């Protein structure tokens, strides 16, 4: 019950900006914004997206995002009623925050429960005048979807953050005040991360008239640093960034040297007048507190509103504070000439441009700077130089200003991160890129981008850091092979419920020439084979020779097959363990029970390899009379009844396949008799040995004496399903350890494989670990129809590495977590600054089928009971089609909130006899409610 | 040009809340709130202040402030157009911020230019829809008066703060979020003060309907900790507080131990559900980081919303975090059962109640707690105990919570300030309380309150710290005598222009028995007399005896009169200097030239007293023939022409008063001749000595020889107007130092009093420093009609101390700064916690004649050229009556915010030939523009 206090201690390390995302005018994501900036593309257009070009006399040109009617409500657990009565700014900001989190190499599970603070800056409540003009019942949810205090809070609620979540409103410099607050809270010890951001969308056509009446707005696009500048043009943004401590960041765009804020005071030129002295003092203070040499600034992201009273004062302050001592012109610029003035999102726009500049390492061109302003002497003395074309920013410090209306100025400094990429051993060999998304098209675009960056391993690591999200959040799971000879790509929708992973190990018969030869490309496989060959060398076996240059005649013998099959199984187990696949169950077929022991932790590499060696040695050295085996189609009981003395049933493969083994003459007589009637009999290459029969009495004992001094007894976990001891005898002491006794019993007694395959669930993902998919048909027939089956190798395949990668991609697509990068040396974090951005992929990989309400200009001017209860409950939540939604998703995952729980309880009482408490309602699924109503 | 960087260094000292003010439901100020809380008065009433009791079905009862239609626009420099288009919340908050600043012992001049940050918390933006339903031109000013980012900024702009000014919106826990930001910024070193505050007024009934639709509101008043609680009732607050470093605070209500914030995260009970674990963890973290023993908390200001889901969880968290180890019940309470739920101003309500509990040292009662909630086990186990009646809180720590909707919790701890008052030497003697205000009634109420606290000197010091504000801000200047035998009270409206304080020193004839006897009550006067008597004792003069037990016969001699008059003049000069009155000019009548030198710094106490002693000794010892003097009504030229040899004109008193002096026989003949015709001749008691005549040739030389070895030569400042050397000879070397030559010349040559009184301005404030108002009539006639005249003493007065205090009160009322507390030992700051609050006085002392626009319910549903130019300019600003406003107040002082300057310039060009730049327009007065148009 007692709660451990948190260690709130001041932080003295570096603060790194890790992820960036946002919607910008004529740019659906950061990549489009970068492309438009670097191609001198003006993002301020004229159309009727918001209102007619001239409605109420407002300026025709504006900066508008592509769309604000799109949102993935189901992903964020917000119901239709709540989503409809929610600000489009909040929806776009939630999407952008998720995209930024993914961009920084973080995920939903990694950021859940962390001490992260949210510092959204928003100031536009026009969606409370349009939605209230015709207020009707069911619009109360606006309280939780439209209040400006709900912007960060929702981010805290969805991502499960537990840090200060506050909303700021500092006019046109709020985004940098949020950054300052995040720096203040990070350097004291309250939080380790920050979600500083900001959104601003234009809805009311009368606010532009308000801004025009004060002479704020100009005629044309913002003419930053231009003599003809007469105002700014409004813009829209939905941007967000993620800040983390530099020591724990997996990607570092840059470092936050420091940010500071100040005010102008009682100036005689009016409240809406910039104070050059205040800005100059703020700059001097920020550059002196951190001891930053102001002459080191390479680029200066100015607050270029384009007015005749703002640009001269800002330039004068910059010249007095940062150009004192500079021996070369200081490159100034702004993003307001490209996409206009974002109002409460100007600071976030400047931050985005600074990050783009320090990521692409090139300064975006500045538009509309034709004639220098005569009132800006710095442009004629050589102190200032507007960057009118792409300039190669190599490295250093970049300063950003944000002068909000009213005199509340803000400054910040960012230090570029110089960790240029170095080649990885990978990026030239095939790799398995696994990911997840909300839509098939989104995942296809993600795979296309991954192929575009097939030569980058840091990008693959950043993608993988968030590629293991649960199917509930990202139901579309997919996998593709980069740097592959043959194209491969799989995408499947995986239900919320997680299926169980079962490792199925094959026995004898998987031998062939070249087994595992291709898989030598992987370092881990070769290392495992070498560490097994070193073990087996002192016993007169050169595993490497038999595996690489071995021939069919060599594999005809008894030893090399056993040795090679065990080596392949152990190496594949090592590959899977390195890749991070934990098996929920383990089953094997005699000779694959040593591999099962190894994978279960009950045995070791030495123990397993030597157990197989001892088995083969005991079989060969003893003069066992020649025998034969074969898989007949007779049923288990039929085989047991029909087998005469001398021939018995070795293994119970499946429902209609049983292995008969016995002496050569009696076996041949059985073959003739069975072929006489209608029965399918298939002979198996057992090297003329009848395993699991009375003939194995003498070998088994020998094996025991062979392995008593080598196999240490260890416990057997319940995951590993025995296939040598009957189910009813699992509780006996002999079925507790995989000692020499267990090996002898397995080598002697029958193989009950059908029972072990029965114990498997009805939808388990069973992976056949073996040199070849020997028991594919047997396993598929035994399991059923709902069980996914994959083989890690294919016989005589031209390339087995691709087969292995495709098999594991199929396994991932069906919902098994794994780490494909575990087969290669780990990437050192933070990654190089050359790693592409992952935000664009997520931005274009959303589920946006539904269109939600947006403010309009016209609003600113003035039968089975079970199915019955199912439909009633679904309607209460707000789902038109109850059957459409998943049956394993809890109610809380949709957005059920207090009032809906009581309504559900009352509806159930009025409809059926159930009486359910409120708490249990939010954690019960549709399938569960159907089960209880049936009960 | 270079700017000195600020020393941004972390602060480790204490932070103290110094001021408090605000409007509360049914409470015009903090005093009314305290009275209502301590008398179990419910502040939630039912009436039609906002809307009908039941309009749209909203709850009838609400918490509403007295009025929101009142504002002193002229005081804050906001024009009529801006004030009309300004949120009433912002206006009330500006008034409350000024009241809080005054309460903490600060003033406008002291807080101007300081590094103070403003952290207003406001969420309500309902006045935007009402003002936009019928939008028309001239409403563009809402951008600078209605935007939420303009709430702190205006406070920064008016008070001239230069620190982070930000607006916060965290919902019901925004006030403690601003306190957290203020603590964060104060401790980093950016700021030295903070104006943390927040306002919330209800305007739209549809908002109440929206809240009701979410089940937020209940039926009756907030039943905090009551089993029948079912919701909260909306309230209104406009409170604000001032925080300062404890070392520089002049008043300390308490100390901010620390505040912290946290979030709830992804809770399964919905976003609008309190998280007990989150609140408990926040409490544990805050009490562990500061090492505060949670068992030391005496009172706990809980966030008692009164809901069935909020109170139980908050109480459980409090019990788990702060009641672990407590051996006595922990007294919990809330300010929501008294005045309801303030929404975005609940934390400020809690802070107000905490500062009231720790100021009055009594815990206010909690209302409506009839039956303990059965879900709160702490109330039955003895761990918790709601304070249902006034409880004597002695001292310790008080904790406040603020759980905002959405899950953003906040905690803060305050340590009481225990500095109980100790008696001052004053508080039983008469004192001069001087103050200023905006209205006569307000100043009368202020004086009534001061009389109520006549026994408190710390209260007087707190009032005096802000009693020297310029007449522009507070035109009504007043003064009253506390602890006075006779009631005195003066209140006058002083123009913006500052008048000159001229000292006038009288000469001979001010003698009388008991001169200065009453003024011995003042410590400084007695000390000065003692330090002069010690000087004059070695020369055979016992000043104390002549001044205390001296008789008429003693004063008939020559020495005692001169000695006593000089002693009184020097003691009054010391009294004035200690009080802090700097004279812009000094003039004196012969014998008052030594006092003028002393007050001007050209002489010392020793030098002046010995100069008078030497004058009297030279006059007496030499056998000067008997002479006589008298002030005739003749003019200067007439006296010069009509005087025969042997009788001359000594001093030019006024225009029609000249002093004739000469030998006894010739003087008597002159008396007979003048009385024969029509002329008024008044004889002056000069001890039968004819001063300023040829008879003084021998004495003067002696005086020179007497004073050559004593008086060191020092420069004479231009403030002192010589009345012994003609104007045309002021530049000569003799008129440079007050050496023995100057004394001899003054004692010999004539006195040019009238000429000295001509250099005095036409509206100067001349203070007659002397034992009696001898030259009252002469000076009044000489100066004119617009000059204020005051005498510090009255002859034969029953009490001179009261006369002196009344004289200085009259002087202050006309606009001369002074410090009446300089005559007593300085009060040690911070003051005792028993000092009453000054916020209430200022709150009820505003100029609220004009009524401004307020949101309405109906809006939520859908000829000389000089005078011509004067009227045009006044109309441009928005003044209906141009002549009404002061002619010496600059345009910037009335609210000009650019744009209007361009309009003024264009109007002047279109109306007259003037072409004035924009910058000069905001610093030019009406009288100045009239002068230029005339030119
Ligand atoms: C009957 C079987 C042998 C398989 O015969 P089938 O013809 O029906 O199988 P199938 O039709 O799917 O054949 C094609 C698939 O089998 C794979 N395959 C690999 N090697 C094969 C081989 N020698 N013969 C036939 N198929 C083989 C192919 O790669 C291909 O998979 P793909 O193309 O996808 O890659 C099986 O049921 C089985 O394993 N029975 C038990 C044998 C056994 O282990 N007994 C235990 C004692 S021997 C032992 O374990 C050692 C000891 O006891 O000491
Ligand atoms: C005529 C005056 C004396 C004042 O007579 P008036 O009666 O006309 O003035 P008034 O009616 O307006 O007010 C007179 C105020 O002074 C007081 N008062 C008047 N006559 C007084 C007297 N003989 N003795 C003591 N006090 C007297 C009154 O109580 C009253 O105090 P209240 O009004 O408070 O109730 C003055 O005008 C004057 O200065 N005369 C010339 C004195 C002079 O300058 N001598 C120069 C050198 S003598 C010198 O300095 C020494 C030296 O040369 O070494």
CSV table of C-alpha atoms in Angstrom, one decimal, chain A residues 107-352:
chain,number,residue,atom,x,y,z
A,107,UNK,CA,6.2,3.3,-29.3
A,108,UNK,CA,3.0,3.1,-27.4
A,109,UNK,CA,4.3,0.5,-25.0
A,110,UNK,CA,7.6,2.2,-24.4
A,111,UNK,CA,6.2,5.6,-23.6
A,112,UNK,CA,3.3,4.2,-21.5
A,113,UNK,CA,3.7,5.1,-17.8
A,114,UNK,CA,6.7,7.3,-18.3
A,115,UNK,CA,7.1,10.7,-16.5
A,116,UNK,CA,6.2,12.7,-19.6
A,117,UNK,CA,4.7,16.2,-19.6
A,118,UNK,CA,2.5,17.6,-22.3
A,119,UNK,CA,2.7,21.3,-23.2
A,120,UNK,CA,0.3,22.0,-26.0
A,121,UNK,CA,-0.2,25.6,-26.9
A,122,UNK,CA,-3.6,26.5,-28.3
A,123,UNK,CA,-5.8,29.7,-28.4
A,124,UNK,CA,-8.7,29.2,-30.9
A,125,UNK,CA,-12.2,28.5,-29.4
A,126,UNK,CA,-14.2,29.3,-32.6
A,127,UNK,CA,-15.5,25.7,-32.5
A,128,UNK,CA,-17.5,26.7,-29.4
A,129,UNK,CA,-19.5,29.4,-31.2
A,130,UNK,CA,-20.4,27.2,-34.3
A,131,UNK,CA,-21.3,24.1,-32.2
A,132,UNK,CA,-23.3,26.2,-29.7
A,133,UNK,CA,-25.3,28.2,-32.3
A,134,UNK,CA,-27.6,25.1,-32.7
A,135,UNK,CA,-26.8,23.3,-29.4
A,136,UNK,CA,-28.8,20.1,-28.9
A,137,UNK,CA,-28.7,17.2,-26.4
A,138,UNK,CA,-25.7,14.8,-26.8
A,139,UNK,CA,-23.4,17.9,-27.3
A,140,UNK,CA,-22.3,17.8,-23.7
A,141,UNK,CA,-19.3,15.8,-24.7
A,142,UNK,CA,-17.7,18.9,-26.1
A,143,UNK,CA,-16.7,19.6,-22.5
A,144,UNK,CA,-14.3,16.7,-22.8
A,145,UNK,CA,-13.5,17.2,-26.5
A,146,UNK,CA,-13.4,21.0,-27.1
A,147,UNK,CA,-12.1,22.7,-23.8
A,148,UNK,CA,-8.5,23.9,-24.5
A,149,UNK,CA,-7.5,22.2,-21.2
A,150,UNK,CA,-8.4,18.8,-22.8
A,151,UNK,CA,-5.7,19.1,-25.6
A,152,UNK,CA,-2.7,18.0,-23.5
A,153,UNK,CA,-4.9,16.0,-21.0
A,154,UNK,CA,-6.1,13.7,-23.8
A,155,UNK,CA,-2.5,13.2,-24.9
A,156,UNK,CA,-1.8,12.3,-21.3
A,157,UNK,CA,-4.8,10.1,-21.1
A,158,UNK,CA,-4.3,8.2,-24.3
A,159,UNK,CA,-0.5,7.7,-24.0
A,160,UNK,CA,-0.8,7.2,-20.2
A,161,UNK,CA,1.6,10.0,-19.3
A,162,UNK,CA,1.9,11.0,-15.6
A,163,UNK,CA,3.5,14.4,-15.8
A,164,UNK,CA,2.4,18.0,-15.9
A,165,UNK,CA,-0.1,18.4,-18.7
A,166,UNK,CA,-0.9,22.1,-19.3
A,167,UNK,CA,-2.2,24.3,-22.0
A,168,UNK,CA,-0.6,27.6,-22.8
A,169,UNK,CA,-1.8,30.8,-24.6
A,170,UNK,CA,0.9,33.4,-25.2
A,171,UNK,CA,-0.3,34.7,-28.6
A,172,UNK,CA,2.0,34.3,-31.5
A,173,UNK,CA,4.8,33.1,-29.3
A,174,UNK,CA,3.1,30.3,-27.3
A,175,UNK,CA,5.0,27.4,-28.9
A,176,UNK,CA,8.3,28.7,-27.5
A,177,UNK,CA,6.8,29.3,-24.1
A,178,UNK,CA,5.8,25.7,-24.1
A,179,UNK,CA,9.3,24.8,-24.9
A,180,UNK,CA,10.5,27.0,-22.0
A,181,UNK,CA,8.1,25.3,-19.6
A,182,UNK,CA,9.3,21.9,-20.8
A,183,UNK,CA,12.9,22.9,-20.3
A,184,UNK,CA,12.1,24.1,-16.8
A,185,UNK,CA,10.3,20.9,-15.8
A,186,UNK,CA,13.0,18.6,-17.3
A,187,UNK,CA,15.8,20.4,-15.6
A,188,UNK,CA,14.2,20.0,-12.1
A,189,UNK,CA,13.5,16.3,-12.3
A,190,UNK,CA,9.7,16.2,-12.6
A,191,UNK,CA,9.7,14.7,-16.1
A,192,UNK,CA,12.0,12.9,-18.5
A,193,UNK,CA,10.3,13.7,-21.7
A,194,UNK,CA,8.1,16.4,-23.2
A,195,UNK,CA,5.4,16.6,-25.9
A,196,UNK,CA,5.7,20.3,-26.6
A,197,UNK,CA,3.6,21.2,-29.6
A,198,UNK,CA,0.9,23.5,-30.9
A,199,UNK,CA,-2.1,23.7,-33.3
A,200,UNK,CA,-4.0,26.5,-35.0
A,201,UNK,CA,-6.8,26.2,-37.5
A,202,UNK,CA,-8.9,29.0,-39.0
A,203,UNK,CA,-12.7,28.5,-38.9
A,204,UNK,CA,-14.4,31.8,-38.4
A,205,UNK,CA,-14.3,34.2,-41.4
A,206,UNK,CA,-14.9,37.2,-39.1
A,207,UNK,CA,-11.6,36.8,-37.1
A,208,UNK,CA,-9.7,37.7,-40.3
A,209,UNK,CA,-11.8,40.8,-40.4
A,210,UNK,CA,-10.8,41.6,-36.9
A,211,UNK,CA,-7.1,41.2,-37.8
A,212,UNK,CA,-7.6,43.4,-40.8
A,213,UNK,CA,-9.2,46.2,-38.8
A,214,UNK,CA,-6.0,46.4,-36.7
A,215,UNK,CA,-3.9,46.6,-39.9
A,216,UNK,CA,-2.2,43.3,-38.9
A,217,UNK,CA,-2.7,41.6,-42.3
A,218,UNK,CA,-1.1,42.7,-45.6
A,219,UNK,CA,-2.2,42.4,-49.2
A,220,UNK,CA,0.2,39.7,-50.6
A,221,UNK,CA,2.1,36.9,-49.0
A,222,UNK,CA,4.4,37.8,-46.1
A,223,UNK,CA,7.3,39.8,-47.7
A,224,UNK,CA,9.8,39.1,-44.9
A,225,UNK,CA,12.7,41.5,-44.9
A,226,UNK,CA,11.2,43.2,-48.0
A,227,UNK,CA,10.8,46.9,-48.4
A,228,UNK,CA,7.2,46.4,-49.6
A,229,UNK,CA,6.1,44.3,-46.6
A,230,UNK,CA,2.8,45.5,-45.2
A,231,UNK,CA,1.5,42.6,-43.1
A,232,UNK,CA,1.2,38.8,-42.8
A,233,UNK,CA,-1.1,36.1,-44.0
A,234,UNK,CA,-2.8,33.7,-41.7
A,235,UNK,CA,-1.8,30.1,-41.7
A,236,UNK,CA,-2.7,26.7,-40.2
A,237,UNK,CA,-0.5,24.2,-38.3
A,238,UNK,CA,-0.9,21.1,-36.2
A,239,UNK,CA,2.7,20.4,-35.2
A,240,UNK,CA,4.3,18.7,-32.3
A,241,UNK,CA,7.8,17.6,-31.1
A,242,UNK,CA,9.1,15.2,-28.5
A,243,UNK,CA,12.0,16.1,-26.2
A,244,UNK,CA,14.0,13.6,-24.3
A,245,UNK,CA,17.2,13.5,-22.3
A,246,UNK,CA,20.1,13.0,-24.6
A,247,UNK,CA,21.4,10.0,-22.8
A,248,UNK,CA,18.1,8.0,-23.3
A,249,UNK,CA,17.3,9.2,-26.8
A,250,UNK,CA,17.2,6.8,-29.7
A,251,UNK,CA,17.2,9.6,-32.2
A,252,UNK,CA,18.6,13.2,-31.8
A,253,UNK,CA,17.8,15.8,-34.4
A,254,UNK,CA,19.6,18.4,-32.2
A,255,UNK,CA,20.1,19.6,-28.6
A,256,UNK,CA,18.3,22.3,-26.8
A,257,UNK,CA,21.0,24.6,-25.5
A,258,UNK,CA,18.5,26.8,-23.8
A,259,UNK,CA,15.3,28.9,-24.1
A,260,UNK,CA,14.2,32.0,-22.3
A,261,UNK,CA,11.3,34.4,-22.2
A,262,UNK,CA,10.7,38.1,-21.3
A,263,UNK,CA,8.3,40.9,-21.7
A,264,UNK,CA,8.4,44.4,-23.1
A,265,UNK,CA,6.7,46.5,-20.4
A,266,UNK,CA,5.1,49.9,-20.6
A,267,UNK,CA,6.2,51.1,-24.0
A,268,UNK,CA,5.0,54.4,-25.4
A,269,UNK,CA,4.2,53.1,-28.9
A,270,UNK,CA,1.3,50.9,-27.7
A,271,UNK,CA,0.8,47.5,-26.4
A,272,UNK,CA,0.8,45.9,-29.9
A,273,UNK,CA,4.2,47.3,-30.7
A,274,UNK,CA,7.5,45.3,-30.7
A,275,UNK,CA,10.1,46.4,-28.2
A,276,UNK,CA,13.6,46.2,-29.8
A,277,UNK,CA,15.3,46.8,-26.4
A,278,UNK,CA,13.3,43.9,-24.8
A,279,UNK,CA,14.2,41.5,-27.5
A,280,UNK,CA,17.9,42.6,-27.5
A,281,UNK,CA,18.0,42.2,-23.7
A,282,UNK,CA,16.4,38.7,-23.9
A,283,UNK,CA,19.0,37.7,-26.5
A,284,UNK,CA,21.9,39.1,-24.4
A,285,UNK,CA,20.6,37.3,-21.3
A,286,UNK,CA,20.1,33.9,-23.1
A,287,UNK,CA,23.5,34.0,-24.8
A,288,UNK,CA,25.2,35.1,-21.5
A,289,UNK,CA,23.6,32.7,-19.1
A,290,UNK,CA,24.7,29.7,-21.2
A,291,UNK,CA,28.1,31.3,-22.0
A,292,UNK,CA,27.3,30.7,-25.7
A,293,UNK,CA,29.5,32.7,-28.1
A,294,UNK,CA,26.9,34.7,-30.1
A,295,UNK,CA,29.3,34.8,-33.0
A,296,UNK,CA,29.0,31.0,-33.4
A,297,UNK,CA,25.4,31.2,-34.7
A,298,UNK,CA,25.3,30.0,-38.2
A,299,UNK,CA,21.6,30.4,-39.1
A,300,UNK,CA,18.9,32.7,-37.5
A,301,UNK,CA,15.3,31.7,-37.8
A,302,UNK,CA,13.8,35.2,-37.4
A,303,UNK,CA,10.2,36.0,-36.6
A,304,UNK,CA,9.6,37.5,-40.0
A,305,UNK,CA,6.0,38.7,-39.8
A,306,UNK,CA,6.7,41.0,-42.7
A,307,UNK,CA,5.3,44.2,-41.1
A,308,UNK,CA,7.0,47.6,-41.4
A,309,UNK,CA,7.3,47.8,-37.5
A,310,UNK,CA,8.3,44.3,-36.7
A,311,UNK,CA,11.1,43.4,-39.1
A,312,UNK,CA,13.2,46.5,-38.5
A,313,UNK,CA,13.1,46.1,-34.7
A,314,UNK,CA,13.9,42.4,-34.8
A,315,UNK,CA,16.7,42.9,-37.2
A,316,UNK,CA,18.1,45.8,-35.1
A,317,UNK,CA,18.0,43.6,-32.0
A,318,UNK,CA,19.7,40.7,-33.8
A,319,UNK,CA,22.4,43.0,-35.1
A,320,UNK,CA,23.0,44.4,-31.7
A,321,UNK,CA,23.0,41.1,-29.8
A,322,UNK,CA,24.3,38.4,-32.1
A,323,UNK,CA,26.2,40.2,-34.9
A,324,UNK,CA,28.5,42.1,-32.6
A,325,UNK,CA,32.0,40.6,-33.4
A,326,UNK,CA,30.9,38.4,-36.3
A,327,UNK,CA,33.4,38.6,-39.2
A,328,UNK,CA,31.0,37.2,-41.8
A,329,UNK,CA,27.3,38.0,-42.7
A,330,UNK,CA,24.8,36.2,-40.4
A,331,UNK,CA,22.3,34.2,-42.5
A,332,UNK,CA,18.8,35.2,-41.3
A,333,UNK,CA,15.5,33.7,-42.5
A,334,UNK,CA,11.9,32.9,-41.6
A,335,UNK,CA,9.2,30.3,-42.5
A,336,UNK,CA,6.4,32.9,-42.7
A,337,UNK,CA,7.2,33.8,-46.3
A,338,UNK,CA,6.8,30.2,-47.3
A,339,UNK,CA,3.6,29.2,-45.4
A,340,UNK,CA,2.4,32.5,-43.8
A,341,UNK,CA,1.8,33.4,-40.2
A,342,UNK,CA,0.6,30.5,-38.0
A,343,UNK,CA,-0.6,32.7,-35.2
A,344,UNK,CA,-0.4,30.5,-32.1
A,345,UNK,CA,1.8,28.0,-34.0
A,346,UNK,CA,4.5,30.3,-35.3
A,347,UNK,CA,7.1,29.0,-32.8
A,348,UNK,CA,6.4,25.4,-33.7
A,349,UNK,CA,6.7,26.3,-37.4
A,350,UNK,CA,10.1,27.9,-36.7
A,351,UNK,CA,11.1,24.8,-34.7
A,352,UNK,CA,10.1,22.6,-37.6
